[PDB]
Design a protein around this ligand. Structure first.
Ligand code: A1L1H
Ligand code: SAH
Length: 209
């Protein structure tokens, strides 16, 4: 989505987000955070995490004490909820407005990127995936959770196709495909699980080569 359309959509979402979309995606969110928590600590016994599209910060309270998490988002409305609820937590290093297409962080500066329900929203996902590879240290990981549209005939595929023109009203691309997370050759796809709701979501871990 164009960035201004992201802002407009998530201004509307923010007051209901946690009790609606956020609530039905909590299991996958917890699972993603559990994976991140389990990764062997980086330097000084800390795991430095970049939360791309941190939103209202529903993942934040689940990060273990050894995590240092930096969250970025495009939406003030969403981010202010993350601030209000979680801004004082010791694991939370900062919460900033930043566009994932252009990350103001050094090459190889993070151990982990978290990208939950965001890659199907961003403008120019090709640019985002390149930035993810750039900021990840060798052997680092991106833990992603996204809906991918299904291939072929049938009712799900048809509804995904019908919702594609509605992106700016909905807040995401319903036709988002797996290929759009795999455009960057420095990121090798590993663990893949289908998660609720209704088997719509894919957890996909990407390893920095
Ligand atoms: C309100 C939209 C209507 C959804 C249609 C119903 C589909 C369920 C039925 C059958 C399954 C097969 C058809 C699938 C068809 C495709 C569904 C789809 O686009 O999926 C992906 C989508 C987003 O995921 P992302 O890209 O990872 O995230 C990025 C964006 N995020 C951060 C918001 O996820 C969902 O659609 C989860 C389910 C909807 C659950 C949302 C909870 C309801 C939301 C708000 C409450 C208001 C409801 C009123 C609207 C109902 C009238 C239609
Ligand atoms: N280019 C971009 N840069 C930063 N944040 C972006 C972005 N495009 C979309 N987003 C953010 O992506 C979020 C999607 S909602 C998902 C929020 C959170 N990860 C969760 O699991 O609940 C929104 O808050 C939106 O503002």
């Amino acid at each position: 989505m164009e960035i201004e359309a992201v802002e407009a959509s998530y201004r509307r979402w923010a007051p209901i987000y946690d009790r609606t979309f956020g609530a039905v995606t909590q299991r996958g969110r917890r699972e993603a955070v559990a994976r991140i928590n389990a990764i062997p600590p980086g330097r000084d016994g800390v795991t430095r995490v970049l939360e791309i599209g941190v939103g209202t910060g529903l993942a934040l309270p689940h990060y273990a004490p050894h995590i240092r998490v930096t969250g970025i988002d495009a939406s003030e409305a969403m981010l202010e909820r993350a601030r209000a609820a979680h801004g004082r937590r010791p694991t939370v290093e900062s919460l900033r407005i930043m566009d994932a297409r252009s990350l103001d962080f050094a090459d190889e500066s993070f151990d982990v990127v978290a990208a939950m329900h965001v890659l199907s929203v961003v403008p120019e996902p090709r640019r985002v995936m390149a930035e993810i590879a750039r900021v990840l240290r060798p052997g680092g990981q991106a833990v992603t959770v996204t809906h991918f549209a299904v291939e072929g005939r049938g009712a799900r595929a048809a509804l995904e196709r019908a919702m594609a023109p509605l992106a700016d009203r909905l807040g995401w691309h319903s036709d988002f495909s797996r290929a759009e997370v795999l455009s960057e050759p420095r990121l090798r796809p590993g663990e893949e699980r289908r998660l609720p709701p209704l088997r719509l979501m894919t957890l996909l871990v990407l390893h920095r080569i």
